[PDB]
RNA sequence: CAAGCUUGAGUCUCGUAGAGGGGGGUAGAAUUCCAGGUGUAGCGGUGAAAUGCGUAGAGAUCUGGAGGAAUACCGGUGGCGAAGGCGGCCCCCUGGACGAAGACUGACGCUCAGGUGCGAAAGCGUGGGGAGCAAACAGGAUUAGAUACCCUGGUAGUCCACGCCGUAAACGAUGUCGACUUGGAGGUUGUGCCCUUGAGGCGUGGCUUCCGGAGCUAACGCGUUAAGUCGACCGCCUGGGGA
RNA sequence: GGCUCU
């Protein structure tokens, strides 16, 4: 999984409170740090196909998370996508 | 999930008289009072009673008559998936009257009769036997 | 870091040889910036079934807080070393640092 | 990376590459290179001796360490060459007093690794260290028969020799063949497995592509005449015979060993 | 009735010996918890140590092989 | 069953001391288990009749310990 | 449409259990093979036999070596996983579940045609490997016959890597999600409290087995893990063959 | 041990 100073190294960088854990852009980059931590090993491992469900789940969590905030405020949306380098 | 309160609300009702329950509590709501108004009205409930502040629980203190339960039948009729709206001719007679259908009117919601007597239909909600 | 937990299994031949390479296993790990917690030789000891056509070798507990790249060292040094027949590593929760019911 | 090509062109068709990105795309270390002039399988009496051998590229020699004598001395790898006389890919290493040299390129080898020769080398692969300093049970290559003899066993492209046991001065080898062969125990080898595994997985597509490789057709002995071969005849297709060489030796079975010098050597045979 | 419950260990040591010879047979089998009454965390920790044991050839795998 | 005669010990004791330890460990079963194999349908079938056959004994032996016969 | 709210959903903290997956190592027992020692006429197999192995010395036994595959006991109507399925031990990488207190976001949710992905064994392809088992096949018996059951052998295959196939009584023959509705005895896994005055006493969560009440059902039976009472969405059925 | 049909 991802470490605990990773973590809160997130939590204080896009939360606005330094304890919000919660919000949408910390759920969002959690996300992302662990999808982009799990290219290197479905890179190695192929076949972990059940590890592979969960790297899934995460993205269509992040993406579930993401519309939502897309609907809800566009400009966080952008400045968000630019500040992690999404595509969409 | 849970799609439909109304429903909830008529189950938990047809299931408490059914297991001889005394009374049924769910959570509150604006529409779910306006029944239990409704039916302490009409004499199939004995009370209602909403308490708490931020998250209500609806209380109903349910009705037995000669040790059998007063509410013999219970159905939803519009649903979610398909509403039903009625005009005042088409208004439906549950049990030729005797039971009565619960409808949600442009002035609240009232039963048939008084829709009837009110010149005006709406939602078809419950028809209560 | 990893608390690790480290036995080996040596030819009683070289019984002698056992505080040399306790000593350089030991520096391995601190010049890694290791720590090291407990460190009981056993001896000589009777096996229960014959390894290697022998009957007795030479036992080493060691628990051990490194991290696990000179721990994989240390795993080659034993898998090269035909003195050490067996190792055994077993990853620990944490830092155990009692004595052992055998070393009593 | 074997590479199917697409059928543009019969000879296109079935051509199986074997695309090695990390060669050099350039000239070859000019020193270690010398003239390798073709023969066409003729001897000094300028009969063909061994047939079917004739034509294909010119190739220059590379000059390779087999024997791997600098001792100490570690070397860095600079880069990975073709080799065109061999079918493993060839390593140039670079030495810390300057020298340069062309090694056996192994599986896992690239560039910028350090290999060291010697007694005191380290068990990586591309170190090369006596067989009584190598532990029982390891793969390697370019395995002496003699001291300082140079490596003569295991060298084509995916190959390695299995060392199962050892009695003081020999250690007894599993050569690639199957069979179990004694060495002297103080005869160099070198760790890992020969680079080009990949090698065997090519498809040549067309006869050019031997051609090139300067093998001459074959001829069927069957479709000749008596004269020529002990096949030749027959009015049809007939065949009434065992099969021999052109020299009327059995083939089909019948073995040839008859080195009486070199038996003492050889724990069990092929199977 | 569990040794483990009353003296309330966190983690079974594969090295108490006396403890795993008193719940090994005498063909070195592992003894079943429906006899010893083992509860079945501490009885998977048992075979776990029992297995590490013999590993490092503090118990025998069996008897015979001697 | 590495048994040893002990002193002064009858014959007819230590052979049923060895037919109880080989009992015991249950060797004869094991090669009678042994002998052909036996598929992992077989072998859920057969533990899964075993584990019933526990449990409908159990509840039928405590419930005819209650009520009479006659 | 705008602003919200926290009960749904989710994030964080600390922990627990686990044959959850992938990769790499390693151990011991046994099988067969090879070499060798003692030894000598049978062995093996069956309902009974024979084929077969054996005086060229088997079988038995002892020592040593090789190699492959699977991991007794633990082991359990035990556990994990979406399903298929997963069983020695160790490490590396890694997914998910659950619990306790809090904190946070604020409906972000459910289902899903088409689509995409996974998907037992058998099978296919390339390259390896190959002990045991074993379709095919061969021989022996049995029989009226015996292209079989039985025996002696035994090849693909089973194993590994990468691709393909995309099916099963792929079954709980029971779609997923959510809500309510009397009980009992257990199993497992957390956790709170009481003086743990013992392995006890009182609770509170998750998963699971058996019986069974109302009710349901053609009946059998299901029965708080529903086949009960309801809601949302999907898939499917419409006489037997032909098919 | 196996031992068909009506
Ligand atoms: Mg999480
Ligand atoms: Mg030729
Ligand atoms: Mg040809
Ligand atoms: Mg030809
Ligand atoms: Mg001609
Ligand atoms: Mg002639
Ligand atoms: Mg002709
Ligand atoms: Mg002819
Ligand atoms: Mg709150
Ligand atoms: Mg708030
Ligand atoms: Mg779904
Ligand atoms: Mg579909
Ligand atoms: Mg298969
Ligand atoms: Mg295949
Ligand atoms: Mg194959
Ligand atoms: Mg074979
Ligand atoms: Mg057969
Ligand atoms: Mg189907
Ligand atoms: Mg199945
Ligand atoms: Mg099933
Ligand atoms: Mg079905
Ligand atoms: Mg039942
Ligand atoms: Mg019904
Ligand atoms: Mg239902
Ligand atoms: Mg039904
Ligand atoms: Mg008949
Ligand atoms: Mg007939």
Same mark, same amino acid.
């Given at each position: 999984?991802?470490?605990?100073?990773?973590?809160?190294?997130?939590?204080?960088?896009?939360?606005?409170?330094?304890?919000?854990?919660?919000?949408?852009?910390?759920?969002?980059?959690?996300?992302?740090?662990?999808?982009?931590?799990?290219?290197?090993?479905?890179?190695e491992?192929?076949?972990?196909?059940?590890?592979?469900?969960?790297?899934?789940?995460?993205?269509?969590?992040?993406?579930?998370?993401?519309?939502?905030?897309?609907?809800?405020?566009?400009?966080?949306?952008?400045?968000?996508?630019?500040?992690?380098?999404?595509?969409? | 999930?849970?799609?439909?309160?109304? &429903?909830?609300?008529?189950?938990?009702?047809?299931?408490?008289?059914? &297991?001889?329950?005394? &009374?049924?509590?769910?959570?509150?709501?604006?529409?779910?009072?306006?029944?239990?108004?409704?039916?302490?009205?009409?004499?199939?409930?004995?009370?209602?009673?909403?308490?708490?502040?931020?998250?209500?629980?609806?209380?109903?203190?349910?009705?037995?008559?000669?040790?059998?339960?007063?509410?013999?039948?219970?159905?939803?009729?519009?649903?979610?998936?398909?509403?039903?709206?009625?005009?005042?001719?088409?208004?439906?007679?549950?049990? /030729?009257?005797?039971?009565?259908?619960?409808?949600?009117?442009?002035?609240?919601?009232?039963?048939?009769?008084?829709?009837?007597? /009110?010149?005006?239909?709406?939602?078809?909600?419950?028809?209560?036997? | 870091? $990893?608390?690790?937990?480290?036995?080996?299994? !040596?030819?009683?031949?070289?019984?002698?040889? !056992?505080?040399?390479?306790?000593?350089?296993?030991?520096?391995?790990?601190?010049?890694?910036?290791? %720590?090291?917690?407990?460190?009981?030789?056993?001896? $000589?000891?009777?096996?229960?079934?014959?390894?290697?056509?022998?009957?007795?070798?030479?036992?080493?507990?060691?628990?051990?807080?490194?991290?696990?790249?000179?721990?994989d060292e240390?795993?080659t040094?034993?898998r090269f070393?035909?003195?050490?027949?067996?190792?055994? !590593?077993? $990853?620990? %929760?944490?830092?155990?640092?009692?004595?052992?019911?055998?070393?009593? | 990376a074997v590479?199917?090509?697409?059928?543009?062109?019969?000879?296109?068709?079935?051509?199986?590459?074997v695309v090695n990105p990390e060669l050099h795309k350039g000239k070859p270390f000019?020193?270690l290179?010398?003239?390798?002039?073709?023969?066409?399988?003729?001897?000094?009496?300028?009969?063909?001796?061994?047939?079917?051998?004739?034509?294909?590229?010119?190739?220059?020699?590379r000059i390779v360490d087999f024997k791997r004598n600098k001792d100490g001395i570690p070397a860095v790898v600079e880069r990975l060459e073709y080799d065109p006389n061999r079918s493993a890919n060839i390593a140039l290493v670079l030495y810390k007093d300057g020298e340069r040299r062309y090694i056996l390129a192994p599986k896992g080898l690239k560039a910028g690794d350090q290999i060291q020769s010697g007694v005191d080398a380290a068990i990586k692969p591309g170190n090369t260290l006596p067989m009584?300093n190598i532990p029982?049970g390891s793969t390697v290559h370019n395995v002496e028969?003699?001291?300082?003899?140079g490596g003569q066993l295991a060298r084509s492209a995916g190959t390695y020799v299995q060392i199962?046991?050892?009695?003081?001065?020999?250690?007894?080898?599993?050569?690639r063949?199957?069979?179990?062969?004694?060495?002297?125990?103080?005869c160099r080898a070198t760790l890992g497995e020969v680079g080009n595994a990949e090698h065997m997985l090519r498809?040549?597509?067309?006869?050019?592509?031997?051609?090139?490789?300067?093998?001459?057709?074959?001829?069927?002995?069957?479709?000749?005449?008596?004269?020529?071969?002990?096949?030749?005849?027959?009015?049809?297709?007939?065949?009434?015979?065992?099969?021999?060489?052109?020299?009327?030796?059995?083939?089909?079975?019948?073995?040839?060993?008859?080195?009486?010098?070199?038996?003492?050597?050889?724990?069990?045979?092929?199977? | 009735?569990?040794?483990?419950?009353?003296?309330?260990?966190?983690?079974?040591?594969?090295?108490?010996?006396?403890?795993?010879?008193?719940?090994?047979?005498?063909?070195?089998?592992?003894?079943?918890?429906?006899?010893?009454?083992?509860?079945?965390?501490?009885?998977?920790?048992?075979?776990?140590?029992?297995?590490?044991?013999?590993?490092?050839?503090?118990?025998?795998?069996?008897?015979?092989?001697? | 069953?590495?048994?040893?005669?002990?002193?002064?010990?009858?014959?007819?004791?230590?052979?049923?001391?060895?037919?109880?330890?080989? *009992?015991?460990?249950?060797?004869?079963?094991?090669?009678?288990?042994?002998?052909?194999?036996?598929?992992?349908?077989?072998?859920?079938?057969?533990?899964?009749?075993?584990?019933?056959?526990?449990?409908?004994?159990?509840?039928?032996? *405590?419930?005819?310990?209650?009520?009479?016969?006659?």
């Amino acid at each position: 999984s991802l470490s605990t100073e990773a973590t809160a190294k997130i939590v204080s960088e896009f939360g606005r409170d330094a304890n919000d854990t919660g919000s949408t852009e910390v759920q969002v980059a959690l996300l992302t740090a662990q999808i982009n931590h799990l290219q290197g090993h479905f890179a190695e491992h192929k076949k972990d196909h059940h590890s592979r469900r969960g790297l899934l789940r995460m993205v269509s969590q992040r993406r579930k998370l993401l519309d939502y905030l897309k609907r809800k405020d566009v400009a966080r949306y952008t400045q968000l996508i630019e500040r992690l380098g999404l595509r969409r | 999930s849970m799609q439909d309160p109304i &429903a909830d609300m008529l189950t938990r009702i047809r299931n408490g008289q059914a &297991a001889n329950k005394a &009374a049924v509590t769910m959570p509150s709501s604006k529409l779910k009072v306006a029944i239990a108004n409704v039916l302490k009205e009409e004499g199939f409930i004995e009370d209602f009673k909403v308490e708490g502040d931020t998250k209500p629980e609806l209380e109903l203190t349910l009705k037995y008559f000669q040790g059998k339960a007063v509410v013999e039948s219970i159905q939803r009729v519009s649903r979610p998936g398909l509403r039903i709206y009625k005009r005042k001719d088409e208004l439906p007679k549950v049990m /030729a009257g005797l039971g009565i259908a619960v409808v949600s009117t442009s002035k609240g919601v009232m039963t048939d009769r008084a829709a009837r007597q /009110a010149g005006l239909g709406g939602e078809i909600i419950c028809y209560v036997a | 870091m $990893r608390h690790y937990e480290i036995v080996f299994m !040596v030819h009683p031949d070289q019984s002698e040889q !056992v505080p040399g390479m306790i000593e350089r296993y030991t520096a391995a790990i601190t010049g890694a910036e290791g %720590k090291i917690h407990r460190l009981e030789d056993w001896g $000589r000891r009777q096996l229960a079934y014959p390894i290697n056509k022998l009957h007795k070798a030479h036992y080493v507990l060691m628990n051990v807080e490194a991290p696990q790249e000179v721990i994989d060292e240390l795993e080659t040094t034993f898998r090269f070393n035909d003195a050490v027949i067996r190792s055994m !590593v077993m $990853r620990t %929760k944490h830092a155990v640092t009692e004595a052992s019911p055998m070393v009593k | 990376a074997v590479v199917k090509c697409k059928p543009t062109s019969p000879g296109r068709r079935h051509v199986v590459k074997v695309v090695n990105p990390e060669l050099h795309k350039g000239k070859p270390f000019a020193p270690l290179l010398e003239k390798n002039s073709k023969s066409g399988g003729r001897n000094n009496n300028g009969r063909i001796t061994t047939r079917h051998i004739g034509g294909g590229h010119k190739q220059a020699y590379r000059i390779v360490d087999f024997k791997r004598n600098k001792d100490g001395i570690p070397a860095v790898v600079e880069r990975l060459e073709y080799d065109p006389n061999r079918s493993a890919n060839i390593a140039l290493v670079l030495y810390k007093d300057g020298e340069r040299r062309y090694i056996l390129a192994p599986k896992g080898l690239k560039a910028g690794d350090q290999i060291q020769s010697g007694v005191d080398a380290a068990i990586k692969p591309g170190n090369t260290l006596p067989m009584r300093n190598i532990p029982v049970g390891s793969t390697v290559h370019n395995v002496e028969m003699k001291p300082g003899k140079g490596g003569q066993l295991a060298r084509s492209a995916g190959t390695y020799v299995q060392i199962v046991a050892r009695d003081g001065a020999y250690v007894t080898l599993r050569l690639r063949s199957g069979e179990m062969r004694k060495v002297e125990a103080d005869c160099r080898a070198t760790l890992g497995e020969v680079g080009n595994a990949e090698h065997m997985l090519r498809v040549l597509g067309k006869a050019g592509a031997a051609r090139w490789r300067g093998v001459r057709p074959t001829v069927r002995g069957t479709a000749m005449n008596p004269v020529d071969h002990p096949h030749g005849g027959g009015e049809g297709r007939n065949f009434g015979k065992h099969p021999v060489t052109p020299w009327g030796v059995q083939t089909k079975g019948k073995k040839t060993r008859s080195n009486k010098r070199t038996d003492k050597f050889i724990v069990r045979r092929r199977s | 009735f569990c040794r483990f419950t009353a003296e309330g260990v966190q983690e079974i040591d594969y090295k108490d010996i006396a403890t795993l010879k008193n719940y090994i047979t005498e063909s070195g089998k592992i003894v079943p918890s429906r006899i010893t009454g083992t509860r079945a965390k501490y009885q998977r920790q048992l075979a776990r140590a029992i297995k590490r044991a013999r590993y490092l050839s503090l118990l025998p795998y069996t008897d015979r092989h001697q | 069953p590495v048994i040893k005669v002990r002193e002064n010990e009858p014959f007819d004791v230590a052979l049923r001391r060895f037919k109880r330890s080989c *009992e015991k460990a249950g060797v004869l079963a094991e090669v009678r288990r042994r002998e052909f194999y036996e598929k992992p349908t077989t072998e859920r079938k057969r533990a899964k009749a075993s584990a019933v056959k526990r449990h409908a004994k159990k509840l039928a032996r *405590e419930n005819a310990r209650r009520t009479r016969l006659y």
